Design a protein around this ligand. Structure first.
Ligand SMILES: CCCNC(=O)CN1C[C@@H](C(=O)Nc2cncc3cc(F)ccc23)c2cc(Cl)ccc2C1=O
Ligand SMILES: [Cl-]
Lengths: 287, 305
């Protein structure tokens, strides 16, 4: 029992964090094999100082790929795990290992918002901090932190240097677009509540996908597609509540609120747990 | 900017997780130097759990009855002893990944990271607090016994909790790393229940100071309160009494924001009376009590926005 915002164990990523200094700027780098990946806004080989713990790495080459700088070093990282670079979609979740001066300070779980920003927790020196998921023994790197926006939210790139969202890497007038709620994630979290014995919000009603989307559009909720309904299939079979049966419950919560009640200890509808996160946390998948 | 429930990086602890098997029971162990620490109920059957005599069960065991697995390598058990509710298995190999560590017993209101494990394999990490009723609101399934709670200050891991059981209300109970339970719990399947829980007042105040640091002041008012009047109001909402120690501990956050502790206590009184009126504080519609004054100073910027 219990339901927490759970991050993946960060150990495989901690063994890759380095400090990158160019002139007066200091930020974080990701050391994989003989390459150090970091935001290009950090800017010859000896101008770049790379520090791994208390050891100085010697830079022997440099190249740029989109908004990421690739520093060729003379030493392969002996702690390099099995890895892939993957680009995630809005609504998908990941773990963030927040670092300062190449030293990891914390780990938290978060989601890529529909407006491509992340509601993270970062301070000056956090640039180069990475987002990831783990599937068996393979680390899938999906995010590298680049900047904070005026509303306190964060923007960054995949590990190939391509930004998530209509953002650029520079000090200019940039604002996050109007955000929306990740509907498929709210439904997954309602199924997690039923699994943990919280059923006060269930009702006898069912709805159509079209009627649900007409209502959900009024509350700044993302449209629910047939793919989302298919993805919620396992949780629907486990609890006995059809997806459009659960949509009628969410429609009632949207038009009436919670009436002083909570769901999984929350007074707001939670959207940062995917259908896969719910199944994984209510099963026991290890790495 | 931003404020998240942050756990410590779990790497130093992952390198200590092993699987302990005794008969048909399998749970997690903590491998530090040449000792594996695990719940003593690993020697029990489900039948034994009603009234287990651990001393009688342990005397019937020899070293080779305990199977310890570290990754894909079998560790050889060369000794065993019991310390309160924890079993200490002496093994023939020191853990090469043993970090700098201490065993610390925490008090209610303190926070820590939990590395949830199954079969000696870590599956996730989350942050939580020792509740005033000595339980933890964790997320654990069958096989999670032996998972540990910790803090990492500097490069030293302070182990403070080892998971032993789930109570009927879904909450969790466990011990420090010396085998002493937190709370009036026993490692028996007895009809024992968690006492009435209360809100950690000093942590809610710390989180209100964190909101002011991140630029939010909608909840402040022009009033103050005496400590006694604050406690008479707070105890009506099931909030823990605020002591002079708590007021002293909030000193740095008060000096950083310019809001006296008792002026922050007046805002809290008003928040309890009025609710939030559709507003949120640090993205939350409830008053958050799982961030200590120390966590706020560690996570927030030293410059108030
Ligand atoms: C109400 C669920 C737990 N009760 C059981 O079915 C049996 N149970 C086994 C064990 C225990 O509590 N194990 C678990 C520990 N954390 C999360 C669990 C979650 C789950 F679903 C099942 C088991 C869990 C235990 C140990 C001790 Cl010291 C005292 C009593 C027990 C005990 O009662
Ligand atoms: Cl403490």
């Amino acid at each position: 029992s219990g339901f927490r915002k759970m991050a993946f164990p960060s150990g495989k990523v901690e063994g890759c964090m380095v400090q990158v200094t160019c002139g007066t700027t200091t930020l974080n780098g990701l050391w994989l094999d003989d390459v150090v990946y970091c935001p290009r806004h950090v800017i010859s080989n000896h101008n770049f100082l790379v520090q791994a713990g208390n050891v100085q790495l010697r830079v022997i080459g440099h190249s740029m790929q989109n908004c990421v700088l690739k520093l060729k070093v003379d030493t392969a990282n002996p702690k390099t795990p099995k890895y892939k670079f993957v680009r995630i979609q809005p609504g998908q979740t990941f773990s963030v290992l927040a670092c300062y001066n190449g030293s990891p300070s914390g780990v938290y779980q978060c989601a890529m918002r529909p407006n491509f920003t992340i509601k993270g927790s970062f301070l000056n020196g956090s640039c180069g901090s990475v987002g990831f998921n783990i599937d068996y023994d393979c680390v899938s790197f999906c995010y590298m932190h680049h900047m904070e926006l005026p509303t306190g939210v964060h923007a960054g790139t995949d590990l190939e240097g391509n930004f998530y969202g209509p953002f650029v890497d520079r000090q200019t007038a940039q604002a996050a677009g109007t955000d929306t709620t990740i509907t498929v994630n709210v439904l997954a979290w309602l199924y997690a509540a039923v699994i943990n014995g919280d059923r006060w919000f269930l009702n006898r009603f069912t709805t159509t996908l079209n009627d649900f989307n007409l209502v959900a559009m009024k509350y700044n909720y993302e449209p629910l597609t047939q793919d989302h309904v298919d993805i919620l299939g396992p949780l629907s079979a486990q609890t006995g509540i059809a997806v459009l049966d659960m949509c009628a419950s969410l429609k009632e919560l949207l038009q009436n609120g919670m009436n002083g009640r909570t769901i999984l200890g929350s007074a707001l509808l939670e959207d940062e747990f995917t259908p896969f996160d719910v199944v994984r946390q209510c099963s026991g998948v290890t790495f």
